[PDB]
Amino acid sequence: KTTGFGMIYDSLDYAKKNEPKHRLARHGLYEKKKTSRKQRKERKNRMKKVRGTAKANVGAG
Amino acid sequence: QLIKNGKKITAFVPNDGCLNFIEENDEVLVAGFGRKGHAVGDIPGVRFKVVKVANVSLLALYKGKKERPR
Amino acid sequence: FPMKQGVLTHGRVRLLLSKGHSCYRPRRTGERKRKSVRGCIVDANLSVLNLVIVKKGEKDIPGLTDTTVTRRLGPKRASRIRKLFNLSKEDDVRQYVVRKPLNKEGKKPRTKAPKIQR
Amino acid sequence: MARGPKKHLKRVAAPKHWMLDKLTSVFAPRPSTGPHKLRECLPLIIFLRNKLKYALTGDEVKKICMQRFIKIDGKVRADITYPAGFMDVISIDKTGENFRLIYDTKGRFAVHRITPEEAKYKLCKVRKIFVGTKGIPHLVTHDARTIRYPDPLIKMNDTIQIDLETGKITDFIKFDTGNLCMVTGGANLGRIGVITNRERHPGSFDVVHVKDANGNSFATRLSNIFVIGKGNKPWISLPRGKGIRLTIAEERDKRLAAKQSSG
Amino acid sequence: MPVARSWVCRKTYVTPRRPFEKSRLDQELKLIGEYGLRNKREVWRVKFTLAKIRKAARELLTLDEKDPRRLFEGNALLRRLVRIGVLDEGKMKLDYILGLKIEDFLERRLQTQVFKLGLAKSIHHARVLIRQRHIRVRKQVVNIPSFIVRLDSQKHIDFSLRSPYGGGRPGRVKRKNAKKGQGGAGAG
Amino acid sequence: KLTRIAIVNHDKCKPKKCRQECKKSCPVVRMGKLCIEVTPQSKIAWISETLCIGCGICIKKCPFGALSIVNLPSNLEKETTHRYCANAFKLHRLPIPRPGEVLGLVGTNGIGKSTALKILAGKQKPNLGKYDDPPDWQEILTYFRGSELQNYFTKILEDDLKAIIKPQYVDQIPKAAKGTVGSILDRKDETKTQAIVCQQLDLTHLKERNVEDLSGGELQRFACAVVCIQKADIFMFDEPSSYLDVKQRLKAAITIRSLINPDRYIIVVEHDLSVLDYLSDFICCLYGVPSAYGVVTMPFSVREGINIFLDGYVPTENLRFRDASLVFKVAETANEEEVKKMCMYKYPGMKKKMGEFELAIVAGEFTDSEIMVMLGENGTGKTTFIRMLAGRLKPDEGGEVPVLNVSYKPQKISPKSTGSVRQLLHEKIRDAYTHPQFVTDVMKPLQIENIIDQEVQTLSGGELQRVALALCLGKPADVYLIDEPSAYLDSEQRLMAARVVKRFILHAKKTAFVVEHDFIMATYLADRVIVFDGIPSKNTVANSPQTLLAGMNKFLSQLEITFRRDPNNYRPRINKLNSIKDVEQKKSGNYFFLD
RNA sequence: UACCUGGUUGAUCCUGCCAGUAGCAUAUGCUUGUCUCAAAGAUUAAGCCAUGCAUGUCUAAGUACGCACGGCCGGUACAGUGAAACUGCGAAUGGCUCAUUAAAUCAGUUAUGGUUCCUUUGGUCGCUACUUGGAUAACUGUGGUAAUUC
RNA sequence: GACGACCCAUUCGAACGUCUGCCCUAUCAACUUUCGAUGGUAGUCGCCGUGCCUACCAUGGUGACCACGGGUGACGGGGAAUCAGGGUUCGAUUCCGGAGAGGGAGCCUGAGAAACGGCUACCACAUCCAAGGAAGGCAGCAGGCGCGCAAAUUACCCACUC
RNA sequence: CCUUUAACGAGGAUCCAUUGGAGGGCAAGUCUGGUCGCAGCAGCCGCGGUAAUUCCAGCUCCAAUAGCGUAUAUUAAAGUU
Ligand SMILES: [Mg+2]
Ligand SMILES: [Mg+2]
Ligand SMILES: [Mg+2]
Ligand SMILES: [Mg+2]
Ligand SMILES: [Mg+2]
Ligand SMILES: [Mg+2]
Ligand SMILES: [Mg+2]
Ligand SMILES: [Mg+2]
Ligand SMILES: [Mg+2]
Ligand SMILES: [Mg+2]
Ligand SMILES: [Mg+2]
Ligand SMILES: [Mg+2]
Ligand SMILES: [Mg+2]
Ligand SMILES: [Mg+2]
Ligand SMILES: [Mg+2]
Ligand SMILES: [Mg+2]
Ligand SMILES: [Mg+2]
Ligand SMILES: [Mg+2]
Ligand SMILES: [Mg+2]
Ligand SMILES: [Mg+2]
Ligand SMILES: [Mg+2]
Ligand SMILES: [Mg+2]
Ligand SMILES: [Mg+2]
Ligand SMILES: [Mg+2]
Ligand SMILES: [Mg+2]
Ligand SMILES: [Mg+2]
Ligand SMILES: [Mg+2]
Ligand SMILES: [Mg+2]
Ligand SMILES: [Mg+2]
Ligand SMILES: [Mg+2]
Ligand SMILES: [Mg+2]
Ligand SMILES: [Mg+2]
Ligand SMILES: [Mg+2]
Ligand SMILES: [Mg+2]
Ligand SMILES: [Mg+2]
Ligand SMILES: [Mg+2]
Ligand SMILES: [Mg+2]
Ligand SMILES: [Mg+2]
Ligand SMILES: [Mg+2]
Ligand SMILES: [Mg+2]
Ligand SMILES: [Mg+2]
Ligand SMILES: [Mg+2]
Ligand SMILES: [Mg+2]
Ligand SMILES: [Mg+2]
Ligand SMILES: [Mg+2]
Ligand SMILES: [Mg+2]
Ligand SMILES: [Mg+2]
Ligand SMILES: [Mg+2]
Ligand SMILES: [Mg+2]
Ligand SMILES: [Mg+2]
Ligand SMILES: [Mg+2]
Ligand SMILES: [Mg+2]
Ligand SMILES: [Mg+2]
């Protein structure tokens, strides 16, 4: 005996709606595209030191 | 002579031929003798014993489980 | 260090600046910072003077008077449009608005207009 | 340390009738400011995900509430920490069901589905009667509602039944010896009985006696009495058990003799 | 510092005050040998549970009869003691609780009941049977020789449905000594 | 774990009323041996470096805040990230590769610097201790959990991180790799970025030139271009400053600076000249013993690190007693009372060329018992005229062959010697004044025994330029022609070697003609300076000889640089190429002061 | 489990302590196969700190002339997604530590009929007008300083 | 529908008050008072009551039932170890309350701060400098030096709780 | 990681249990060699001066056991607050 939990959605649009995104990615319906938390962090802290169009970090990393 | 205070005490090196493991000007870790303030046994004026010679215990050197680092 | 109006000296001094002053930009609601500034009296020791022309002379300067001007941006509020083009109190102000031209090559030609407020 | 108001609530300090665990996490819903006090309310997230199991996390109850499905006292609440309280009406018309938050017997709220014709009014206890500008009489009820122009024979501690759609006080019961009541605080939190006495101590905490439908008597403070009927006749529908508080021995006898294990 | 953890735990035994007492020593060794226990901590454990039961019983026994608390907690302790079978249903009163002995709880272990019910050839065989997953209580396979067997559960002890001793594929020894006929004398 | 000693010189430490309690409370000074020799005097409190055990006792019983506590660093299995064999060099730990910025490394010869770059490249599995038979990457992944190097190495192994390494030498592989003219451009990783690099870096003059007809500065610019045109993310430049002229170094620093921003980790080896304040971001220092062990310290900001490591005594956590003032030769010594006679010469105005290098010298003065150095951009004919005056060709219009035997030190050190350097220690022989000359060159701090017997092929650049040094002053000769000694030598090394050449050609009353590219050596090697002017490979008129001051001040005014002294270190720094501290120095012609 | 044992004497009976005995929590020594749970720079220096990160934020609904993309043709509140910047809100919560502090803090008990309270919920909203004024961001362009979120 | 808004009530609080409760010390027996100590009248200031502060009066207030002074390797409590019955010792530490951000001090914005992931000075440290100037606060999470008998990774993630 | 599962995986010589002790208090040897008031042991009483039940070792045995010893704070023993 082995026990778990199951859900049956009345459609695929409602199933694409609620559905925590990590569970959709268990069968291809979603794809978490980013790199790394520390990259997102250190980038944001460089963007904080420039004013106006932040070309060096919205484009040039 | 103790590091944190600078006081000068007298300590006991208990075993057969364990005084050979203790040169001069090497730091040793001492503990109490077992009566919390008093001289134990037939020894006058002594209240502590030596338990470590240089980061290595006097009971591993007494059984050969270790050796001094030089 | 920048010069600022009404610091009546030819020396350099430290002032406690707040919002609304010049030579300072706040970083937080209510912040005030002590900053160095130069007095407004002109002197031999500047790096630059900023000079504006008020009355034009006779001979065109070969570098800044030969060129032309642009409209840049048009007026965006309706009353400014009226006062600019001298319309009446009932004059249908939705057609005298400036159309900005574009045509960055590789895209079709085009015109924009700002949304009118009030 | 504490220069202003707080906004977090620790799971160990939350009210006990929420019946929470101690291993999910350090934090609790912390109901937002509303018409009911913090220690006497029941947030929406706890009522939906814990007692009804409709949701499984906080995201699910957030996206249930963000679809305009839940109505508390007629109006549509979108907040998931709204402090729902005593004698309130929940309405979920996508499934056609209405509830009513009332303490059952053991000092905690029950799940008390009611008929749609009963989910139209609610009973309210009067706390204050003052006069505004131009001599207009006002009311203040136990859930912050204010009523202008009540009939000038309703006073404090009396109960008024109000229409949920329009306000507009409909009828009222008077605080008198012989009237059904439910206790809403203290040790007898949930028990129902008739008054039969009211002891008076000028300056502090006039106490009131009660005697339920089996000859048991218990007292409380006047601040916790709630008249809910004229006498031996409730105006709202009573839950299962009807605030009788059968002792632990009778509890065990009825749980064993009935052998209530499953179907 | 704040964490979602629990720190509740306790000891389950107590050492004896007199460390070297010949009578206590040999009495606890008699008890270890006849029930096939591993340690003396496993005797001090049962002693601790019996002492706590006795303390609770004597505590309830000093209240006056007709006290609701005494009635409730006594009728509960008695029922819970009969549920494991260390008390006769014909006694069922707080006076008989102070007559129990340590070998009423050591009797009711699973290792004892597996030998005593006849699935094993000794208690020292029974411990290695239980600890090697051969024994099943209803549908559950129980790995633990200290599993205190309730009363109604007494009928249901037998062998695991996938184990050599009853409806099971033979172990790795009967399958290489058999492979000896094929891969030990037929292929090598 | 370490050794502990005390530093005592601090604010107004006076044994006048200190009551000398330092010696009153020491275990070592009581047992008989001399540790703290301080009595009521007019002296600064004395302490030894080897006699005090430490134990902090002398610190806890002083009334005035004089005595402190410091460490001496030595190996005791500090995670030993790489070992080679028994009694052989070991590295301890590496910095995390700071992304989006220049992480520099500043260190000496011997101590670990190439080993770090090789491991950070993924090319070398770090030994982490004792040997694994295969190079097992599971060691580095399991040893460094809980750190950022775990993810970095796991992403190295998945092919997503492409690393590029600079060759530590340009002279090691003009033998195996060969590239055909024109096609050498088309073979590179990209087409449109070649123009941007060649235009900013100045390969433009020589892209279509014969690759064998080039000089060493063009080979460095070619290596630079070939490395930068390859798109990757990890980039290692093992001393890109090595034998480039100062404005070449500046534009190469600007071109690698142009590639910091788009998330590509760049690690440069950086015993560099004083151009610091826009050309590297964080720096890390190196500690250890050159022939035995090394460690890299935590990352520091560039100015902070240069200053505390140029002071030596300032770093806050940990210390080492070395790195005295070594950036220059503040120890002034000059006196010439023996120079009663001299044997001067006068060369005519020879002008030569091979196929495209127009060269022309002016007849000038050729002194004796005195030195002369020349300078200029690479390609103005500095080795060309040297070895043509030694003699290769053009006996057509005048010409005086050196009647003197000539000592000669090349820049292209790559000997073809089967055997060892102990052999060529006998082709030329030390049968000469056996007094300290080589033991005062290097005997105590550098162990010249490593240069007596070694493997000639695996020798480091330092010891290579040192056998280049020893090739000169051991052969019977009277005129020294030394070309680019400063290469693969660090600050003290460069200075000590140049000074050795100076006062060893001084006492024997002979002449030296020096080639240089680093300002500090061009200053402290001569009083006469010939300026090399002209556009490379079009016309480079070798200027008439002059003195040092006018020569240098007319030379560097053609590069648009200037140098600023330092009031506390006397260490010359560049300005920004315009600044309010530079503008007046430029119009006044003085590019250095405090003579 | 409401418990004692050795030591003053040639031997005895006491006072009386030293030592033994069991737990508990800090350190340390030797040794360690499996599995669940899980304390952890408090003690001494509330001593000093290299480096990275820990507070930000937009819906149909405050201001869209960035050609930044982009439409079926243009802007006639003007398409649509929407960088930047102005504006509104939050940053007074949480986290950390225990130096100070002896009717002080704190705990139970009561009082504001002696006060303030963003927000939430409920009451209150009538004694040129078919819509007013000028002026700063972003953006464009010229710069200053060794150097900064100038 | 969204947003905004004077006033009242409700909610979340905050602040100031009532009664009772405290470790060792007499080698601490008298303490407090124009440098407000206790009370009275009028005011200033404060969100409000109030010597909170000012002017003018009165001479009061506390103590052997331990006041006043000193010490604490003292943050308080819910609680922890041991325990026949009574007790003894511990509580820096995950919940509640208080206090602080190297030491003092003064303020801006704001409903709410005497805020330090805010500002302004002095003291103590300490960083860069082109010597004119500029910049700082890990008793937050990792990490490092020092101190010691004595205490962990410069990791991954917002999937759970909020 | 655990749990579920394949395929391999034990003869006892290794897929090798330690920490303290054996005069008394206090469970366990007047067994054999070495030292000879020395080395050392010993919380206390006490062991060692040529026939040592206590030292150094070998063998044997006792206690708890994946744990056991030591220094210190504190509680019971203490009806020695
Ligand atoms: Mg368009
Ligand atoms: Mg508008
Ligand atoms: Mg807080
Ligand atoms: Mg909330
Ligand atoms: Mg006597
Ligand atoms: Mg005797
Ligand atoms: Mg004792
Ligand atoms: Mg397993
Ligand atoms: Mg601390
Ligand atoms: Mg930092
Ligand atoms: Mg938008
Ligand atoms: Mg808000
Ligand atoms: Mg705010
Ligand atoms: Mg901590
Ligand atoms: Mg005091
Ligand atoms: Mg009080
Ligand atoms: Mg309280
Ligand atoms: Mg209170
Ligand atoms: Mg409202
Ligand atoms: Mg008054
Ligand atoms: Mg008054
Ligand atoms: Mg008096
Ligand atoms: Mg006092
Ligand atoms: Mg005091
Ligand atoms: Mg304290
Ligand atoms: Mg206390
Ligand atoms: Mg008790
Ligand atoms: Mg506490
Ligand atoms: Mg403390
Ligand atoms: Mg802590
Ligand atoms: Mg409180
Ligand atoms: Mg504070
Ligand atoms: Mg500090
Ligand atoms: Mg606000
Ligand atoms: Mg502050
Ligand atoms: Mg804070
Ligand atoms: Mg700041
Ligand atoms: Mg901080
Ligand atoms: Mg930290
Ligand atoms: Mg944390
Ligand atoms: Mg240490
Ligand atoms: Mg520890
Ligand atoms: Mg440590
Ligand atoms: Mg989350
Ligand atoms: Mg775990
Ligand atoms: Mg043994
Ligand atoms: Mg022994
Ligand atoms: Mg023996
Ligand atoms: Mg014994
Ligand atoms: Mg015995
Ligand atoms: Mg003998
Ligand atoms: Mg013998
Ligand atoms: Mg005691």
Curated annotation (Swiss-Prot), chain B:
The gene is RPS23. Belongs to the universal ribosomal protein uS12 family. This is Small ribosomal subunit protein uS12. The chain holds residues 73 to 142 of 143 of the full protein. Component of the 40S small ribosomal subunit. Part of the small subunit (SSU) processome, composed of more than 70 proteins and the RNA chaperone small nucleolar RNA (snoRNA) U3. It comes from the Eukaryota. It is found in: Cytoplasm, Cytosol; Cytoplasm; Rough endoplasmic reticulum; Nucleus, Nucleolus. The modification N6-acetyllysine is found at residue 63. Component of the ribosome, a large ribonucleoprotein complex responsible for the synthesis of proteins in the cell. The small ribosomal subunit (SSU) binds messenger RNAs (mRNAs) and translates the encoded message by selecting cognate aminoacyl-transfer RNA (tRNA) molecules. The large subunit (LSU) contains the ribosomal catalytic site termed the peptidyl transferase center (PTC), which catalyzes the formation of peptide bonds, thereby polymerizing the amino acids delivered by tRNAs into a polypeptide chain.
Swiss-Prot record, chain D:
It comes from the Eukaryota. GO terms for molecular function: rRNA binding; structural constituent of ribosome. Keywords: Acetylation, Cytoplasm, Isopeptide bond, Nucleus, Ribonucleoprotein, Ribosomal protein, RNA-binding, rRNA-binding, Ubl conjugation. Residues 42-104 form the S4 RNA-binding domain. Belongs to the eukaryotic ribosomal protein eS4 family. HAMAP family: Ribosomal_eS4. This is Small ribosomal subunit protein eS4. It comes from Oryctolagus cuniculus (Rabbit).
UniProtKB/Swiss-Prot annotation, chain E:
One of its GO terms (molecular function) is structural constituent of ribosome. Coiled coil: none annotated. The modification N6-acetyllysine is found at residues 66, 116, 155. The modification Phosphoserine is found at residues 153, 163. InterPro entries: Ribosomal_uS4, Ribosomal_uS4_CS, Ribosomal_uS4_euk/arc, Ribosomal_uS4_N, S4_RNA-bd, S4_RNA-bd_sf. It is found in: Cytoplasm; Nucleus, Nucleolus. GO terms for cellular component: cytosolic ribosome; cytosolic small ribosomal subunit; nucleolus. Residues 162-188 are annotated as: Disordered. Signal peptide: none annotated. One of its GO terms (biological process) is ribosomal small subunit biogenesis. Pfam families: Ribosomal_S4, S4. PANTHER family: 30S 40S RIBOSOMAL PROTEIN, SMALL RIBOSOMAL SUBUNIT PROTEIN US4. Component of the small ribosomal subunit. Identified in a IGF2BP1-dependent mRNP granule complex containing untranslated mRNAs. Part of the small subunit (SSU) processome, composed of more than 70 proteins and the RNA chaperone small nucleolar RNA (snoRNA) U3. Component of the small ribosomal subunit. The ribosome is a large ribonucleoprotein complex responsible for the synthesis of proteins in the cell. Part of the small subunit (SSU) processome, first precursor of the small eukaryotic ribosomal subunit. During the assembly of the SSU processome in the nucleolus, many ribosome biogenesis factors, an RNA chaperone and ribosomal proteins associate with the nascent pre-rRNA and work in concert to generate RNA folding, modifications, rearrangements and cleavage as well as targeted degradation of pre-ribosomal RNA by the RNA exosome. Belongs to the universal ribosomal protein uS4 family. This is Small ribosomal subunit protein uS4.
